[PDB]
Symmetry: D3
Subunit: 298 residues, 6 copies
């Protein structure tokens, strides 16, 4: 299927400057060339225009920083993603902080009966204004997409929820807020923390994940946050957490997904050039995209 790249230079879902440079860092790491090589009809649709954050004092509220700007940008993203899907192309979204998942999922989900999601990350991203210890929307996209959160975020695209809890698989988690542990537990979301990765190995984790979703969804969205990988492998992220997934485990994960042919949409987020060591993180993301799209060693 042809691919359309949409850059979302988003940094409103958080407070550290630099993550808005993620889309072009990956471009500069050679994302187009890498995929053309695999014989893809790749198209770069450019970047979604992101506004300037409204003063904290007139925004949606403290627990939801930049609510309106984040919401607006996500609306635009959702429209772009929708069009791409309508054109029969695979939407490959580049971030940008994780709050963009709200827009991506909004543009995609409506096209599937039962959309599944693989959240490759160090965090669960299932906070709400109530549970968030930061007020940063980049830590709420999964919860919002499940229909839990401020309506300005849960209603992006004019519908909700985008996916069901039983259709989500979290992988690589190692940093959950108390509220989130409760949410995951209560909503019954399938999760493989680093404990399971270390205990079962990435091969079993991926095998179980693929089987689980293939068995109950009609499309699967890969929402990959680079902080899911260990900071030594992906140093350029806003909220790094040690003891993460290795460079090799991540390639095995992408290769298995490619092999399974279940990924129908994808986004690579949280790449921050300003916190990186010579674009290493954007490079990992591009290499991972290569594997996901079929690049093989033999």
């Amino acid at each position: 299927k042809p691919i359309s790249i949409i850059g979302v230079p988003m940094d409103l879902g958080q407070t550290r400057r630099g993550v808005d440079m993620g889309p072009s860092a990956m471009r500069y790491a050679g994302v187009i060339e890498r995929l053309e090589r695999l014989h893809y009809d790749i198209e770069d649709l450019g970047d979604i225009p992101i506004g300037k954050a409204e003063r904290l004092h007139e925004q949606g509220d403290s627990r939801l920083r930049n609510l309106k700007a984040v919401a607006e940008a996500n609306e635009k993203l959702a429209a772009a993603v929708d069009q791409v899907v309508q054109r029969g192309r695979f939407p490959l979204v580049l971030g940008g902080d994780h709050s963009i998942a709200i827009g991506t999922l909004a543009g995609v989900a409506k096209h599937y009966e039962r959309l599944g999601v693989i959240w490759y990350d160090a965090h669960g991203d299932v906070n709400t204004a109530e549970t968030s210890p930061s007020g940063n929307i980049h830590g709420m996209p999964l919860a919002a997409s499940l229909g839990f959160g401020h309506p300005a975020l849960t209603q992006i695209g004019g519908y909700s929820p985008k996916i069901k809890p039983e259709h989500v698989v979290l992988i690589g988690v190692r940093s959950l807020d108390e509220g989130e542990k409760k949410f995951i537990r209560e909503k019954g979301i399938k999760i493989y923390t680093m404990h399971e990765v270390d205990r079962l190995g990435m091969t079993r984790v991926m095998e179980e994940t693929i089987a689980y979703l293939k068995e109950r969804t009609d499309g699967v969205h890969l929402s990959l946050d680079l902080d899911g990988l260990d900071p030594s492998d992906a140093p350029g992220v806003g909220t790094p957490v040690i003891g993460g997934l290795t460079y090799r485990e991540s390639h095995l994960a992408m290769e298995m997904l490619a092999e399974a042919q279940i990924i129908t949409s994808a986004e690579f987020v949280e790449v921050n050039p300003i916190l990186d060591e010579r674009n290493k993180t954007a490079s990992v993301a591009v290499a991972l995209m290569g594997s996901l799209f079929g690049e093989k060693l033999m």
Copy 2:
């Protein structure tokens, strides 16, 4: 069960300065806070007073450096640990070179019919004056606790041996003196060298270890030497050996032990701030303690 912390600023069992700073580096790495967060009744009993070593030429055996001072301090530790166990609390001992295991085991062992020991280390620590290539008592604690060595060491606490060979499991070993290989072989001590860890995986090694001990002991003491981990993960150790256990394997190990609920006492040793990179090693110890005491990702 409530926890009591006992610091043993010991460096007499070896020759490199700095390991005596281990207890406070771990305190500064936040050991109390980490455990309080887990809802424990944690108490810090302070540090055992360590004497000064007498003139080497006045010492009566070069194969046992600082014997008197090491024995003396270990007696004190044994008393302290005994007191804690008597009070119904779990003794968490912080080192300090590994020779302190002699005191810890002396204070604990007497309270169990068949105490088991998990020696997580790169070394066997089973030397004697006869086999030691260094004369450093920090390389003799396991042998001494098994009743093999100078009576000044084997009789701490007024009894011997503290544990039986068939109740010991060595994990992470990769540096054994010839005499030690003979000792382990002949005494029939269960050992998983890096070869087994690589070949079987930490999960299998830990499963077998837990099953083995749970099946024949009434308490299990964890004697964790930070040099068991790779020097890249735990740089601050006096006798580093490459090709060690990773940060993740160690967390998995602690997590499985916690899960099994078999650990009845523990000690974290060989942390040396002076050979470290910004307290990294002390921090690893604290994070591993978190996992040992039940800290979970989900």
Copy 3:
């Protein structure tokens, strides 16, 4: 005097991706805040729109890569800078590869009888299509501004030359192409290579430079290329050259310039986040700007 910031996300004057991210890396390194603290009326005019380069095979000269797009963008910059000077504000230009000096000098020069230029760099940037070993316009801005090169470059702003050779002082030079050595020699441009910096000391070099220019110009433009500093201090540059100016020498230089009160415009260029170590280079630029604008230790 109030300051106006103009970002020029330019990478057309060279071939390595990333230098276009320079303006925002410096913004993220806190340029506005640093200057506001000094009590300045600082204004950020945004970024000059940079077009896309036309097909190389369609371009009419390989010795002048991206000539049209580079000229076009420089025209825009010149207009913007002119506007700022007309408004009685100091133009602070952020790059972006060094080819932007053509636009900056074009907008400024017209306002002075004898504009002086301090070129703090590892290179002379005095190549022409004839002498350039690369065809990269970023290595030609000083020559072009002196009226030497392709008219598309020498005529930006509708006039030429912008400055006279006798009013230029090169500092920190350590990498000159043969043609450039000839140019500097023949045009009689004052130059302090690393040999002079080492031999005389930065203090003497700066004293002589300030006296020289103050004695014959009515305004002085500081064109600071971060690659003038040693790669260990400023790693994020496209063409690093070892044996450069230290962090301290650069602060002393800026401090002496501020003290002299001769700088009437300035530009900080060649910052590339993608070749950097956690925005270090952009940070150095911001700290140097602080000193240039009067920041003092006591």
Copy 4:
């Protein structure tokens, strides 16, 4: 003159754990051996007992954290230093955060008509409860010794002030709070910030400093804070500030002082093993002490 070493494991004048390990890190870096080699009658008097900080809520006040504990410890230090001086020995104090300077100066000053002070540091340490942005007493010792501050600190030793402003020379300063700049300016304290070091060179700075003091004091106290050196040379400090004095400049400074024979008392502070890279900082301090006490290359 014979030397007496007094360790002051102080961390109450600040908030980061670890600086209390400074005295023994330097001991472990071999301070005694280094000085014995120079044929000194060196004596180690041990460490001053430091209490536990009183709860913020019952202490002297917010702007003066741990006031009573700091004061008390300084009283003890002053008594110890006084005795040493009375015994005709040179007092060499090892810290420990800089607040210990209050005790050292109290024990020394009373023995001189006009005691001079060389404050080798990145900071001025002339804050008061009024000007302090932290409430940390380690940033007030110089001001307190000049008689400016809370009486609990200004009256240590039963007298004040300990020295006169005109008898103080600050060297290496590069991080002053606004209040401090005012204090220095108004009290007329001689200061050589990094600007002067870069501009005049360490040789001239030291020459001027030595002449200045030799010309008006009857004894000179060297209060050396390791953060005075660049963080790359002395990484183990609580409040590092970039762009500092090099390893060589510091040795030249010590060698010139030794040569001048004007230093009558000294203290090396802020060494923190826990923030260091393999005791590098304590090692620098010991090497510097070697130079100060006469160690020469030829």
Copy 5:
């Protein structure tokens, strides 16, 4: 069986200087000492004399650089290896770029009915003048040994092919040229790329490899290219490729081979001191050789 060491200071099969220093870096890393310790009758036969590259204008070597010189050196190597085998000694060949495999296999193969080969590498080394993107013979030894390539290479030793495709097992591959992918695919060579290593694990991979070869060969040659290990573990190699085999995986591999007792000859290649970090790579090689030759942890 007694061991004979033959150094082959070869760098003709490639273009980066330094790999000719491989043999002595390993000797300096203690290869003799390490093997003597295991009680071997080790003999060092010295180095094969290698020639100088003749003028390109003279002889042609665009697709086959240094053909004559590489061929002549390999003839010498083949003779030396043959003699050692004839003397009933195990030939341990130290390189030197991988083109030396042509000579090693030529001297060994003729002595076995069905010689097997384990090619531990990041590359396939199965290029031909036709498929090679570099013209570097160090990327053609496996193809040449299989009887595919220039006769000057395929006929070394006076016979061809040296081994059969079905008796070859590639391990650690992660960088194959298109032509090589086709070759491996068509020739039916057994291969475990990093995908298989990650998916099955090194234990499984080695078990399958040993059973596969033991089941159909009468001897097995280990051709170990240090670049098979990740660049972080073996930095000193001419063509590093990230995402490689770890230091522990490699030890496990060597330990299992020793255990299986199937290796009848071996070579360690591509060690380049000039691209290394303090002989780290030569050190890993010596360590791996120790394991291969029976060194055990217990």
Copy 6:
């Protein structure tokens, strides 16, 4: 004057393996290319054949390790150097441990009435069997050349002494053995330790050195030991000593010597690839050679 390169792969004058690799690491760092570029008639005469160390039990060398082998190699070197000088060519000797200076000076000195020597080093290299704390001849070449030491060393070339103490200038010294301090002091050798470099600066030091020698010699030999530079700049050396000469200071030194046109012969020694970081040290050497031979920035 035409240049002849003579490699001396010597490691007999010391005990750490690797320094014998110095000559080719420099060749690989591009020494020929660098000098040809300066339009020199450069010739590479190859390497002096060096022997193997004979059994300690056989010949004695505790205070004079490898005496016979070091002496014999130096005789060969002396002949080679003599011939080159006889042919009217400048002898450029590449080491190899510093003991080779004995052979270089032996081949050169006889051709001058008053040969001067600039010993750029961290050490004095003026030990004798009596004063040497190591028995390593690489720490005795200067003393031996001055006619002090074992006759096997002092008589190389059939004459002694090669030079006079008053014609020697040591630069960069920071590590002298007590006996050496006495020797230098008593022999009246001119020396600039790091204290003088720091105090006077490299410009002053070189000016004084050039005027001193130019005023009383008819030729000057540059004996440059890379360990004279700081270990951060030249990491690959057998006996590094911190607080050394910077990369820039060394270039200035070479630039001033070239300018003075007083150097008539030279040798670059102690380069050890095996203790280096990617040939960095050999690279610095080649760079310094370029400056020495006239390479200029302008």
